[PDB]
Symmetry: none
Subunit: 258 residues, 4 copies
Amino acid sequence: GLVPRGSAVPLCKQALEDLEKTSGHDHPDVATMLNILALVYRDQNKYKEAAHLLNDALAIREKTLGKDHPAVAATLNNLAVLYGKRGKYKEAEPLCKRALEIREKVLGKFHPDVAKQLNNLALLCQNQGKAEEVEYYYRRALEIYATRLGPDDPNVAKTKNNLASCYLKQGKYQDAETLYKEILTRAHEKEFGSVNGDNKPIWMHAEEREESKDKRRDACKVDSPTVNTTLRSLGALYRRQGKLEAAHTLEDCASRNR
Amino acid sequence: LVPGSAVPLCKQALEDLEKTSGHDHPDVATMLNILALVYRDQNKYKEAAHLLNDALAIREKTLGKDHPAVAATLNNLAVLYGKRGKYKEAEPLCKRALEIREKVLGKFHPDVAKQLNNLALLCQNQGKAEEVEYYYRRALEIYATRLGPDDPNVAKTKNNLASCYLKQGKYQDAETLYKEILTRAHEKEFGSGDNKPIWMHAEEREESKDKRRDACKVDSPTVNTTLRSLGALYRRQGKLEAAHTLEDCASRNR
Amino acid sequence: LVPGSAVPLCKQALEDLEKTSGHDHPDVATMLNILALVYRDQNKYKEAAHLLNDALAIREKTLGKDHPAVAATLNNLAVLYGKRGKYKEAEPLCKRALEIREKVLGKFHPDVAKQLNNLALLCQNQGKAEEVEYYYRRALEIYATRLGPDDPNVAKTKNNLASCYLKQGKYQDAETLYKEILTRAHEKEFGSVGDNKPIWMHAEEREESKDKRRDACKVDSPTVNTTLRSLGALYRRQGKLEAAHTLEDCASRNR
Amino acid sequence: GLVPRGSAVPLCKQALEDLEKTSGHDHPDVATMLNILALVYRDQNKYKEAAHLLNDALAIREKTLGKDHPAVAATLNNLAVLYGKRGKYKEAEPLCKRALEIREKVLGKFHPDVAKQLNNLALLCQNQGKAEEVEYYYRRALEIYATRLGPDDPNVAKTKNNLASCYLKQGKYQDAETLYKEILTRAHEKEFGSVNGDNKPIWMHAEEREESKDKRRDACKVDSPTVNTTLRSLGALYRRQGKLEAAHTLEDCASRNR
């Protein structure tokens, strides 16, 4: 709460009433002031009050700027976020979906900011338990990240981890496994290059030690908070499959990078 | 959270108040504070801190050196200074806020703890390990008492204090803290010889030389971290099989 | 006096000083003052005054409430306030600058007069005629004494006080002042007076002798001309049109 | 003197040396900082020192921006001003004359800003006693003011007064007299609109009262600082010509508007 709880709201309301007297209600400057006031309310963790005003700012902006304006998308985003903070994910979704459409129209389907929007829509659907759809938006986002940015951009593996987790919820263990192994293979193929036959990724060592049931733990160097997550998540998969030694390989590898 | 046209419109509102009330008025300080909030939304932290320092100047002259609203401003300014890596400069301002908060609310009001937490964090980024130590301890004292012994904040602060010890090579003192946390969580559900914590089982599983690998009923995100941190300490000590007990337990709660 | 880009470049210099010395340092207050100067060059008096107030805040905490560099800041801030037409808020700042200046330099140091002159001008734009009166008299007191009785500033201040009297309907008090300036100027050239007579004496006697005849003329100064016409205006008010003509023709003959 | 006499120069010098180390000496930012430093010196009435730095700022700007850039015109104009403040009018003139050539090129011959530049050159030449050149520049300025702005713009009469004064120094009494009469005929008819024959300008009344052996001492509703100046100046002309009653008409008219 950067602004103290007293006097911020009434002083903003004055500044607002003053702008309304100059230009009338349907003016971009009123929408902007309504937006500043929403920012003040959000600073006090008053999400419902901020969303109510942002809705009023939204209607002004749709009229004066057009239903396809970038600032109309910015307002729909913020609104969805505010509904999300209240657990109102169902009613947030269409406003998020509407923001995506303007965003796609203005910037182009493959713009890195469309990727952020898609990521938010997937998140909204996830809190609703709509897995079919979480899956759709994460793929779309991954498609942008992996292509419009380098394949080893930090968002690639992050989105891949989120999508693998979505798969697990659906019981698509194969598709999750493949994703985790892609992240680990990519990271192994980045510090090294070709596999010499013994230049194997960690997960091949893991499964091969399960093959000869090796009760011994005593590949490491690969380091990232996201890769560590991948290492433990594939390890959780191996646990379900009853491959404890495999899990141990990846889990003990994760511990050494902590 | 905001969409140009924001700063300029605020600057009008400020001028209109200044016109009415004069510069030295709480409402002008507030409006500068509002304008700082807009700047911070645009990620302009130097500009935001400058305006908050202007708000501070007014509030000092109008409300007094020891006013609650002055403490809030000094704290917010310190947050902003911290965000630009100006930890050395934020420190005096954070100490000043603490003095006020202690005077106004008492030494042991929960809001003091959160202030003490920031002080610790401000010293850590400067590498003042001894002062971090003091501040976290001061915070823990309030958390473990004014809220329950098994409050989320208690275990968080104990991990944070433990990491501080780790940087000083006080492995003993860090160890003790992790055990306290786990022993509490094992005692929150049982407890309290007939009933041994996991770390005890772990160390007994090296005492018996038990290579056969893979109490395991604790559920908390903070406790997982604790388990992996103590296992890290066993690794340093060479007690690799003791590490596995706590780490496999963590994996099983993930 | 300068060509954009100046403010941004200054803000870097300012940030570099804060980085080195912290916010509460004289050099930061100075750089803010320098940045105020740049803003004032671009006619941005609001932004200039704001930065000077920031400089003031620093100099107060670092140098003290009574430091000469604070007085300079308070005065400069007041000038800028006045330029935006906020004379009410400029007044307290100006008074404080006077208190510091009196303390540090003495009551009667020439630099106090110019500060008293600002106060007078500041009170005038508010219409506080009694205050204006006090300040100009206080300033005159320093001018007529410290510098020579017939120093440029003495006649300037007498006219300014006389104009103040005119707004209050103190026509008689204004009249006296103009005659003082004219009698002094008639003494600096001719000597101790008669039958050396100042022009205003001849003028009123020309009215006294009902003479409508028309064109003493050895009094040269831009300030004296103003005085001649100002006293002529007073005679016009009184009805003494022939007395007015005498002083106004003398001014015309020195133009 | 808005900046305190101490430390302001060293701190600027620091800022400058920092810029020189980042972008080299021949960078516009160095020229701008040299300019800021010149502003600081001017605030302390150190004209010679401010001019020296501005000269260095000019050299950088001529090379980096080109010898015809508006900022080169601004620096030349600022430099002539400073020379003028030291009474160095001869050496100021070419620089001020160069600013005019750049200004004419960039804005066009009849831009109101060219009218101000011409006015400055006229001022420089006047301080030198070069009355033939003063005349040429005031005419050029008047030509712009009277056409690019309304005929009864404040600068029209101001420039006409300046030009009439220039004429008096040369002994061109008739040309001065004509100018004064134009300003008063303009203002008289701006008050009325049409001359009925009874509706005469003040100076016609002045010369007619001089004609008829008239006594005769006291149309005067024309209020302006620059018109009173015109009234007293034409009055001085009448005095010169021995027409005292005519002088008195205009002089008593100016007294009524004081």
